[PDB]
């Protein structure tokens, strides 16, 4: 019918029921339970009304811990006897004890081995902390098992830097200082991390490759899997996470160099010393790891539901999020999975009424995402020819709730205005602000640094399923979820993240009780999808892009101005880049002026201008791609090789500029910087010409 009919049709009770449904048993990727869930989702989508639902299967590499031999960590004395043992399995949550599909805590794609040796604390295991480790702390990390705390960095970069330093084994634990909200109890009497709680994740530096055995091509039935030696992103070091109870029993005994900084400390009753070994009478004891996990090729299934368009069936608007989870995962992704299922049900009801979208909509319950983006990347690779010439935008959906403060939205600049325009029509679910727009609350609590009246919209960055659609194929990507008070809380993400305690009861009592914040996140994502699919003209704005573009230019300029003298000796000039941005600005202004008054009654010209807007994003990727990262093609928002978490724009220049002071040949490095500036300026000018007048 219209926008409002779809928006109101969304029901919090249905999301409640679906979240109850998907969280009673584990649904780990590549298992019979996940296959049954995929079949159930396919059948539900078919009976809702979806035009065509397929079960696209791919034989992709995955990892599991073997049942007979469990994985754990131990403290071994000189005589060889084991002293302390790490929890073989975190305590089952109340109400979930009979279920035996809960896998023990483990990190995916961790190679087998039984490393033995001393332990060194490396804080958040960032590049900076390693930099402290050798330059000033004078500690040789090579040949020693390492212990790291989560936060501020993806696990992949953590293990990568650990390998570079020469670590023999990597141990991951959550520090309550960064994973225990003050004033809140632990599960099952709070939403903090119990001492048995262990966070889980995959150690993969895929760099958008996808399946580590078939980079660039789908893992079809006839495919040729590369050898395990030539795999991409596979770590060469065993890694297994633990909690903070057992970590404290191990952290306390270690002794040596005192922490150099206050940031080198936490809430646990530990000296938090950095020095290797355990001081005192127990110097002989050392850490020993016991990973016996296996990597095998397992068939994963992506449930793709296509609802055919009515006017432009070729144009696909994709909305999808993963469904695999280490444990029940009531918050990741089943919280988002239920949201996606509710949008699918509402769209099916609308189709049953008779309404037809103006563009074909592709819903996709992905798979194997917790093992790297695997499934989504493989399905994109399979249909790259169709998507990169027909796709419009990809609206990701995952972890709708992480705290009840506001609505955090990360989207490409093209639909910035849309994110604003949609948010004004909605209603605030938060404390206070009854009857006021979600936009007003979002601005009040999360104001944009430039404009007080504007809300703050962050960039896409990396992670999740939008990576392959945005950073490789150049398709607009958007994300929206309810977020906490990052201003006044420290814990990055909710404390009960990727653990057994991610049950339905957690999300109900210690998070959105009425499932109203879930309702509003579903409203936002479904509204973005509906606007992208049922707009006569593509609802993008080039001008904002141009605007924000200048910003990052200055940013990428400023870092270079950290070395003015060098910028004069090698004639390094951003004037080409600045002229490119100024071009982009003027040409985008002219294009928007044309768009404001160009005739819409002619389908040919309308298709022309919609193609212009759609390929404007696709004008930014370069087929050569970023250096050493062919699958990262965006030159504006692709994650950098260093400081991938931070997400600084113009990644090529930033990686060229990163650590530019310590280079053996300054002339060659600055020449590479000039090359990156030339590439970026050419790409911006090419996008501007793509937006320029045709013929």
């Amino acid at each position, epitope marked *: 019918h219209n926008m409002k009919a779809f928006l109101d049709e969304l029901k919090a009770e249905n999301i409640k029921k679906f979240l109850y449904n998907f969280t009673q048993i584990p649904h780990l990727a590549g298992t019979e339970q996940n296959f049954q869930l995929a079949k159930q989702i396919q059948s539900q989508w078919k009976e809702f009304g979806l035009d065509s639902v397929e079960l696209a299967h791919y034989d992709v590499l995955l990892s599991y811990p073997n049942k007979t031999h469990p994985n754990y960590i131990s403290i071994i004395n000189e005589d060889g006897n084991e002293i302390f043992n790490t929890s073989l399995f975190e305590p089952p949550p109340p109400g979930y004890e009979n279920v035996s599909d809960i896998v023990p805590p483990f990190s995916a794609f961790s190679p087998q081995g039984m490393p033995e040796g001393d332990l060194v604390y490396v804080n958040y295991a960032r590049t900076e902390d390693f930099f402290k480790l050798e330059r000033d702390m004078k500690i040789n990390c090579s040949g020693k098992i390492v212990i790291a705390r989560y936060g501020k960095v993806f696990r992949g970069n953590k293990v990568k830097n650990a390998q570079l330093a020469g670590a023999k084994g990597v141990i991951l634990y959550s520090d309550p200082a960064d994973y225990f909200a003050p004033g809140v109890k632990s599960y099952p009497d709070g939403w903090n991390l119990p001492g048995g709680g262990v966070q889980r994740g995959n150690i993969l530096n895929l760099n958008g490759a996808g399946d580590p055995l078939t980079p660039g091509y789908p893992a079809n039935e006839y495919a040729y899997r590369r050898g395990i030696a030539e795999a991409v992103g596979l770590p060469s070091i065993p890694v297994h996470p633990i909690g903070y109870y057992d970590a404290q029993k191990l952290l306390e005994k270690m002794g040596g160099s005192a922490p150099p900084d206050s940031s080198w400390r936490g809430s646990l009753k530990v000296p938090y010393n950095v020095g290797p070994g355990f001081t005192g009478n127990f110097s002989t004891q050392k850490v020993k790891m016991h990973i016996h996990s296996t990597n095998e090729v397992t068939r994963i299934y992506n449930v793709i539901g296509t609802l055919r368009g009515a006017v432009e069936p070729d144009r696909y608007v994709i909305l999808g999020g993963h469904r695999d989870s280490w444990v029940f995962g009531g918050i990741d992704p089943q919280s988002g999975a239920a949201v996606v299922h509710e949008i699918v049900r509402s769209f099916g009801t609308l189709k049953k009424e008779g309404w037809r979208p103006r563009r074909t909509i592709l819903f996709a319950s992905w798979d194997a995402e917790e093992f790297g983006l695997l499934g989504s990347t493989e399905w994109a690779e399979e249909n790259s020819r169709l998507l990169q010439e027909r796709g419009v935008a990809y609206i990701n959906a995952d972890s709708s709730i992480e705290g009840n403060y506001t609505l955090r939205v990360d989207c490409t600049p093209l639909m910035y205005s849309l994110v604003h325009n949609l948010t004004k029509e909605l209603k605030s679910p938060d404390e206070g602000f009854e009857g006021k727009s979600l936009y007003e609350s979002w601005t009040k609590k999360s104001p944009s640094p430039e404009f007080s009246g504007m809300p703050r919209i962050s960039k896409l960055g990396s992670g999740n399923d939008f990576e392959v659609f945005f950073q490789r194929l150049g398709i607009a990507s958007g994300r929206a979820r309810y977020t906490k008070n990052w201003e006044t809380n420290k814990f990055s993400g909710y404390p009960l993240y990727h653990s057994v305690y991610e049950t339905y009861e957690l999300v109900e009592k210690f998070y959105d009780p009425m499932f109203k914040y879930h309702l509003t996140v579903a409203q936002v994502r479904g509204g973005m999808v509906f606007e992208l699919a049922n707009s006569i003209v593509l609802p993008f704005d080039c001008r904002d892009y141009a*605007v924000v573009l200048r910003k990052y*230019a200055d940013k990428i300029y400023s870092i270079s*101005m950290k*070395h*003015p003298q060098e910028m004069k000796t090698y004639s390094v000039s951003f004037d080409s880049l600045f002229s490119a941005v100024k071009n982009f600005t003027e040409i985008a202004s002219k294009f928007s002026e044309r768009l404001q008054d160009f005739d819409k009654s002619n389908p040919i010209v309308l298709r022309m201008m919609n193609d212009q807007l759609m390929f404007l994003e696709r004008a930014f990727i370069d087929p050569l791609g970023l250096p050493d990262r062919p699958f990262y093609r965006h030159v504006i928002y692709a994650p950098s090789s260093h400081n991938k978490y931070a997400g600084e724009s113009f990644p090529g220049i930033y990686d060229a500029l990163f650590d530019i002071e310590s280079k053996v040949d300054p002339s060659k490095a600055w020449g590479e910087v000039k090359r990156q500036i030339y590439v970026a300026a050419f790409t911006v000018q090419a996008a501007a010409e793509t937006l320029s007048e045709v013929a």
Partner: nanobody
Amino acid sequence: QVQLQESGGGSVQAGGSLRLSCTAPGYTDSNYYMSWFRQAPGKEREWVAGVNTGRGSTSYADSVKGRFTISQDNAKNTMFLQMNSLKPEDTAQYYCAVAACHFCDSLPKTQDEYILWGQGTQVTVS
């Protein structure tokens, strides 16, 4: 790297005057965001003042407004922060930073945006 050369401040009684300096070498011919940040004894930083060399606009904090004015120096890569009527909460240590800009669309007020940082100090007694 290049490090800002900053000076100014000192032990001045309340209600007097003073002036804070900060120089950005190599920034003689480039517009830049020059701003000042104050961190209190045992507390975090706060925004007090800033300038936009690209557009010439100047903005101050609400409490700072009507109290504290930036003085431009003859050399374009240097600017001053004259001080007056110090209230004993201006006992903390100031900090000056520069953010190089070409378009200079908006002056940043968060410490994350700025890149080059100095080490300023001053003490105010009642």
